[PDB]
Design a protein around this ligand. Sequence first.
Ligand SMILES: CCCCCCCCCCCCO[C@@H]1O[C@H](CO)[C@@H](O[C@H]2O[C@H](CO)[C@@H](O)[C@H](O)[C@H]2O)[C@H](O)[C@H]1O
Ligand SMILES: CCCCCCCCCCCCO[C@@H]1O[C@H](CO)[C@@H](O[C@H]2O[C@H](CO)[C@@H](O)[C@H](O)[C@H]2O)[C@H](O)[C@H]1O
Ligand SMILES: CCCCCCCCCCCCCCCC(=O)OC[C@H](O)COP(=O)(O)OCCN
Lengths: 155, 1034, 144, 48, 48, 48
Amino acid sequence: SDLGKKLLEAARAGRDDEVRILMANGADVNAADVVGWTPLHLAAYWGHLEIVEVLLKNGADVNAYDTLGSTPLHLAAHFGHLEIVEVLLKNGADVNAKDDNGITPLHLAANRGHLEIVEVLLKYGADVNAQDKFGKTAFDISINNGNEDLAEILQ
Amino acid sequence: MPNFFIDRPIFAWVIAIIIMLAGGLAILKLPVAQYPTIAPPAVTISASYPGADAKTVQDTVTQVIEQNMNGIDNLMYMSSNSDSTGTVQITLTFESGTDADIAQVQVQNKLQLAMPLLPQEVQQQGVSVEKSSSSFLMVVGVINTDGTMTQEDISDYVAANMKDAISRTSGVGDVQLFGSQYAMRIWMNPNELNKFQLTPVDVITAIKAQNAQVAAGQLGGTPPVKGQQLNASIIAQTRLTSTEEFGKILLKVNQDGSRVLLRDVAKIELGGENYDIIAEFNGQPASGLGIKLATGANALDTAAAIRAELAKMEPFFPSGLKIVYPYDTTPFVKISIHEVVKTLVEAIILVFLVMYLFLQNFRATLIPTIAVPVVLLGTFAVLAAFGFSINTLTMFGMVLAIGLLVDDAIVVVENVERVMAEEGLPPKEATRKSMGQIQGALVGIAMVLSAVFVPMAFFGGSTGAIYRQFSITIVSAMALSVLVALILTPALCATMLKPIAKGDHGEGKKGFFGWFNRMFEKSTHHYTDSVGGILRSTGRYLVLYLIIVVGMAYLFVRLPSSFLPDEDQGVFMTMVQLPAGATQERTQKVLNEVTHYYLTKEKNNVESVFAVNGFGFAGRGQNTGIAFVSLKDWADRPGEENKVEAITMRATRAFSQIKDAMVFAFNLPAIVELGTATGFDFELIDQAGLGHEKLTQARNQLLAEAAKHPDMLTSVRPNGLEDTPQFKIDIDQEKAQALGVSINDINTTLGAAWGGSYVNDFIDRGRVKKVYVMSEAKYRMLPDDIGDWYVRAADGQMVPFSAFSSSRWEYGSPRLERYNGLPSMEILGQAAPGKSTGEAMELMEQLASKLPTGVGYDWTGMSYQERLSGNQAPSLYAISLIVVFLCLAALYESWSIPFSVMLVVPLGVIGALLAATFRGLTNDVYFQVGLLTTIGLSAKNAILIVEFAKDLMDKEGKGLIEATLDAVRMALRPILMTSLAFILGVMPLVISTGAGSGAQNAVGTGVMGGMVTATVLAIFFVPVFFVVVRRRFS
Amino acid sequence: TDADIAQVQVQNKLQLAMPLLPQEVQQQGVSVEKSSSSFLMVVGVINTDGTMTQEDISDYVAANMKDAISRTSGVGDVQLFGSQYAMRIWMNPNELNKFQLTPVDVITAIKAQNAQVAAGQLGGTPPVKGQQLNASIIAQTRLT
Amino acid sequence: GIKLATGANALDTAAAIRAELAKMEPFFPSGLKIVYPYDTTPFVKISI
Amino acid sequence: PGADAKTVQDTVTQVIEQNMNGIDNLMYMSSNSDSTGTVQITLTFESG
Amino acid sequence: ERLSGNQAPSLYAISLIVVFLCLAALYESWSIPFSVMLVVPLGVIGAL
Ligand SMILES: CCCCCCCCCCCCO[C@@H]1O[C@H](CO)[C@@H](O[C@H]2O[C@H](CO)[C@@H](O)[C@H](O)[C@H]2O)[C@H](O)[C@H]1O
Ligand SMILES: CCCCCCCCCCCCO[C@@H]1O[C@H](CO)[C@@H](O[C@H]2O[C@H](CO)[C@@H](O)[C@H](O)[C@H]2O)[C@H](O)[C@H]1O
Ligand SMILES: CCCCCCCCCCCCCCCC(=O)OC[C@H](O)COP(=O)(O)OCCN
């Protein structure tokens, strides 16, 4: 669609006023680029909290997965967007969502050492014993990275 | 000196002949090019990393070279960009007047020492250091019409056969192949490699062993066993020469004894070094040669010689191969020279008619006919002596000089003819007196005109180089005209003219000339009566002058400004930008529509369309492309409807309908070398290691704030590309070491297959060419294909890539910019309608100061030039204005009288601005030089009136008004004769619709309109100025 | 004598010797300079807040100041009174022997795992017919 | 420690250095300050 | 080293000579390639 | 050698014209120079 491509650009750039106008005209919130990223994927990636809430109000798929199985929660958790992670989880984001690699939001959060987000994910029932394709847990990542603070949280 | 040559006419002829031979000689040896060196010296370092992303290229090549670019003299700034095609280009721009050879060798030398710091793959490919500031003479296109050859097949032929021959051609200074010669392409198959337990590592290792030059030695070499009779060189293994030999390359021998060859696990063919660019000429496969003119070479002789060489190659071309000329700059140079000769021929013809209309004797009409060509040839000699060339700017400089060269010829002859008609002296005695009245004034005029134009040449940068072409040409032409006026024309006048009886004004004749002489004598009495009445009431005319001065200032401010006028060049471009991640095939479909439009709807305008898929000026990639539209001759495109600007608008509006593509046409700049030169060039710098993502957010902020000021700033966009989705693959080190797979074999198998790998060289028909190994298209397209690639472990087991790897999507830069070593982002923009570029920069600086901490800025290119040029202008105007006064002050022997002359400046400027504003032109160089020349002759007219008026008061003791009325009477005829001839002389330039009309229009309009007012006003205002000034001061 | 031509001639001959020099000497970067023996000036950099150490100040001058000064016309040579930061791997011989490893194994591992790999593109040229995707493949990057 | 390039003007080069140092100062971290403990050019300017 | 006249002409001499284009005041260019693998490309220029 | 012989006629021509114009300027005549320049072949034959 026309507005679908404009919303993808708007959501990424973080133009809240343009997104508002697009939601009124009826821009496709389930619009996806070649890699399978929705406006919510982009908003979550670039850390645009206001647009994440606006998109979710307009029936945006919270558990949308790209062509490699990654969801908006994976991106929000990986790039340390605490506010967006909470909003996504409140609106029913799969906390134990596995990509094609078997990586979870907890794995990604633990890898970059986002202590706040890790505790938010565990609060909403993140599987701490969840293993990726190599059999690595969020704890196995913490001890390898040498994050003593993160290591204590996962016990 | 005039007296010296009046008595020695043969001496005067000798000097005139010496000048002619010097000029004739200069014309033969003089270089000939469209434009001279305008842009400051620029050296571009180009490197290539096959299969590398923008960040890999930046962090291993660009940064390493940038840090080593020290100890280099006269560097202004350094700029670079690293893109996802595996390319980096570092441009080092130098101070104007810097030796480009010394600049390049100093840059080259620092690169050489930095080569051991670069990756092995980059050292293999090598790093080119070229003078990029130079421009193309023409672009020779090579196509195949019978579809027997691909662009790779055509490219190889041009390289192997044509390139060196054209490079050797007389006057050729550089030849760039638009494509690459053949390369031995090994298209690997992962299914077959895995079947025989082999990898790209084995394929590369085997090629390096079985395609190599091996050193052996000699039979009976020194030191020998005495008694040895024969000494022969030993030839061992040499390079492979054919696809067949590469096919027979052994990889493995099985248990049963069967042999695994390279042709079993790969497709082997001759192809291009890269497949990024697809070149089409009217839909047919195309290559070409970008030919640059050598230093001091003749453009017209060079192009003729290039066509001559290609004509001799024609009988040896394969069937279907054809030569085409989509870009050629020689038609401009040939027309620029032709229209100069035409103008100066018509100028001499026009003088003859006006000279005979007033003087009515052929003996007087031949003095300007001799004097004008002598001074013109003289200019060519001075032009050559100062190292200048015959170019558009120097050629239009001589067209703008004719008005001042013609004036000197008329003023001298007319004054002699008047003195004879009034006093009744013989030609010899008449000339002695006639020259005595003007000899001191002409020397004074010469010094004043010098003070107007000479300072204009002392501008710095690009604008100073352009002005210097006009300045030196006009000052040279002006200077020689005065020497010829004080040597030749006095001698000619004294010998060639016929005596006139005292009080013989030709009123005693019959027919037309008898009637004309009566009319003009009656009109002179009418004019002198008008001045008499004007001088009774000077008060109201001083008020009328201030209205002209205020009216002048008003128009000068409101007249839109632009360095050079947009010309119909017979060529323009159509940019094609597709969305992020768009493929080569998708971009081709859009280019085919662009090509289809131009050959359908513009069949009567467009000659050919050169469709280049993969290349853009603002960045490269599969999602970009440009179509170079080549038009028919200007004589086969009548009216404004069939011009570049009209077609540009039609094309832009037509391609607006196209979806998922930003497609629009636009004309080339007047000078391709210089660039856009309309707006500003802003650099946004990371001064505190903020990083790419943070510099993007600061850029978006500056752009957002620029959008909130449409009244000041317009079209403020980034020059570079935006971030795109990129396939991040994480190799698990633990899993690799566990299965016994080395990281080298993993990173080689990935890099070689998906990216390509330059292994070594082979010799194809006595020509050394590259050998590339790479995956066959269908096995390196999608992320599912990653798992089809296997790497052998230490235990000999074949492990798939999926076993020890994990992938995700992230965003990254496909083109990373750096300015002066630091990370940057180039931002373009221009001042809003009515607003100046200087004001727009002031706001951009203010907006930039409110950006986050560690985010800096700088002005580059045209912006850097404008600011340092704007600082010089005030000081140069001041110097120019002070010397004009000092010269006139010495001439008249008065601090006050000079003002009477300097007050005529606005009389010529108002007419030029009225003409330009009416016709809808801009305040350009050609116009600005047109004003300086208009001011020159308007001042010259006034200088003689004031001198004559003053001399009558000093010598003959006449009154202020008596002398002024007597002066304007004597000055009326020669002023009208000069103006009539010169206005008719620049008539063709104004009405010109065809080739190089944008230049001729800017030249003609400002001059003609200015001359009309400078003529009509001055004859009534000069007498007022002198009288009002004389009354005030003593 | 023209110092520009003097430099060109000296380097022309140095380039014949460059390949014969040890690989460690080349990778440190050989420099040819046309400058005076004495110092024109010394540009000192201090911290009045005592927020940065002698080692912190030296790195900042090297990383953010030195290059721009080195590129300035008239500046023949620039000497950093200090050193730019490097990733220092201070080896322990007791712990290396403990796991039967040597400096050779450490250097092999760093070159392997601190690497900037050129991994090509998805849907790269020459592509197949009907390709819609074009993305850069990003493998190992330099450690930060 | 800055050494003058062969033939180059001492005062003009010194001015060019101060111009480049002035472009850096704004983006310094807190506390960092340029000092001038050794310069041969002030003598040349003042002496003349 | 160890390359015949034909091999070194194709891989060195012709590769260098084809890039010796657009040099100012070049009168003529003479070169020889021998069995010791030695290449000497002499470029003679105009007087002055 | 080829270059020396090719430019020799041009050199003699320009040399004669310069000497002629020089005389014409000094003697204020076209005829007197012509009377002098006619003596050139009387010398040239002797050299030959
Ligand atoms: C035929 C006789 C006429 C001869 C004409 C001689 C031409 C004049 C030679 C000097 C040309 C260069 O002109 C030179 O420009 C520089 C700027 O770069 C000026 O330098 C300027 O510096 C700053 C720039 O912001 C100004 O504020 C200041 O007013 C001015 O001095 C010089 O004052 C001027 O002399
Ligand atoms: C703006 C349009 C372009 C026009 C440019 C202006 C200059 C050309 C205009 C025509 C000039 C001739 O116009 C001239 O005006 C003056 C006005 O003082 C007249 O002079 C008038 O006043 C004086 C006294 O003050 C009387 O002695 C005189 O008898 C009377 O006619 C002249 O007789 C007339 O010839
Ligand atoms: C490419 C070369 C071109 C330039 C070569 C030089 C051109 C010379 C042309 C000059 C001859 C043209 C004029 C005719 C001369 C001529 O015919 O000579 C006789 C005349 O009467 C003039 O001489 P005269 O009055 O007797 O001398 C004074 C004695 N007191």
